[PDB]
Enzyme design. Structure first.
Site, PDB file in Angstrom:
ATOM      1  CG  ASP A  35      29.160 102.751   4.597  1.00 44.78           C
ATOM      2  OD1 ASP A  35      27.964 102.609   4.912  1.00 44.78           O
ATOM      3  OD2 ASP A  35      30.090 102.882   5.441  1.00 44.78           O
ATOM      4  CB  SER A 199      10.175 103.214  10.037  1.00 46.97           C
ATOM      5  OG  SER A 199       9.194 102.231   9.757  1.00 46.97           O
TER       6      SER A 199
END
Ligand SMILES: COc1ccc([C@H]2SCC(=O)N2C2CC2)cc1
Length: 330
Positions: A35, A199
């Site tokens: 994770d 992004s």
């Protein structure tokens, strides 16, 4: 040193991925959920409340000759999905794919929430976010990566998650046969303890690319792609009959649909998520309403590039002095 381990979907939907991890001496092999959005390595154990164990493999520290109780240490974690676990702490030897760390904090669960109990395939979590998020008290502990780093050939790990198929976690090297083209690197903020990056935009299907900054985290422990409501609405508007359902808890779509792809930007580069990756199947057994793999982050407080996004890429988690993230197509 290096390590390399195969990671395997837990079910037919790729809801999560498990990776075998050797703990203790002799080794006890547990299948952990790696994770990158948390920083605790915790396991089902011989200390876990018996009624809360249902099919998981447990770690038994008393059977490990290298286990040592970390005196006075406790831990307690809550995850974005509302699940939680807590307990006490041992140090022991932990190996992943041939890479060994001695003295790793292994957090032994005394309690786990129902969602963990109900998932027989996940024996615990192995956190790979920054150690500043580790919940052990009163002395915070380091992640497996943080402990291994100095010994690694290069201070990196990579995630290569499969679509409906096994993939690979590598530590200490970049497998240049595992991706196509080049790896595009992008800046990371560690201020929230995550692999947080920005992004450069998105496209839906064969549509034009929209240049827009989207700040989010690369999180292998989250199944879906959670993005701003505007972006998610633009995606689902291209699917006839798709709608946001308050009763179901997100966007659903007719299972008869063909889903468009979704592209996200990494600098000037582009990662394309095939439409199929966005299908999470019937909302309940036999239903013709299917659950979408791209959902709104509104109400989470952060955008999350979870498995839906990451499994479309070869992803480098660069733990150099100034961390960065790299993405390649594959
Ligand atoms: C409401 O319909 C769904 C709701 C959720 C899912 C998938 S996404 C991640 C996850 O844990 N899931 C559950 C099947 C375990 C799929 C369909």
């Amino acid at each position: 040193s290096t390590g390399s381990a195969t990671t395997t979907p837990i079910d037919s939907l790729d809801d999560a991925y498990i990776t075998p991890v050797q703990i203790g001496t002799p080794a006890q092999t547990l299948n952990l959920d790696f994770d990158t959005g948390s920083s605790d390595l915790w396991v089902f154990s011989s200390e876990t409340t018996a009624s809360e164990v249902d099919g998981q493999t447990i770690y038994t520290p008393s059977k490990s000759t290298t286990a040592k109780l970390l005196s006075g240490a406790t831990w307690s974690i809550s995850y974005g999905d509302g699940s939680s676990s807590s307990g006490d702490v041992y140090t022991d030897t932990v190996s992943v794919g041939g890479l060994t760390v001695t003295g790793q904090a292994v957090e032994s669960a005394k309690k786990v929430s129902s969602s963990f109990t109900e998932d027989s395939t996940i024996d615990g979590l192995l956190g790979l976010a920054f150690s500043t998020l580790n919940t052990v008290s009163p002395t915070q502990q380091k992640t497996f990566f943080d402990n291994a780093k100095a010994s690694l050939d290069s201070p990196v790990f990579t995630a290569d998650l499969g679509y409906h198929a096994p993939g690979t976690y590598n530590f200490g090297f970049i497998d240049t046969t595992a991706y196509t083209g080049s790896i595009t690197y992008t800046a990371v903020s560690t201020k929230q303890g995550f692999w947080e990056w920005t992004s450069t935009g998105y496209a839906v299907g064969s549509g034009t690319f929209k240049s827009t900054s989207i700040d989010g985290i690369a999180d292998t422990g989250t199944t879906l792609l959670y993005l701003p409501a505007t972006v998610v609405s633009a995606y689902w508007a291209q699917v006839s009959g798709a709608k946001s359902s308050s009763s179901v808890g997100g966007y659903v779509f007719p299972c008869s649909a063909t889903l468009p792809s979704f592209t996200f930007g990494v600098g000037s580069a582009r990662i394309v998520i095939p439409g199929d990756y966005i299908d999470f199947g019937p909302i309940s057994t036999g239903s013709s309403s299917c659950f979408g793999g791209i959902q709104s982050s509104a109400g989470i407080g952060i955008n999350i590039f979870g498995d839906v996004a990451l499994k479309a890429a070869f992803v480098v988690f660069n733990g150099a002095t100034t961390p960065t993230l790299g993405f390649a197509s594959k």
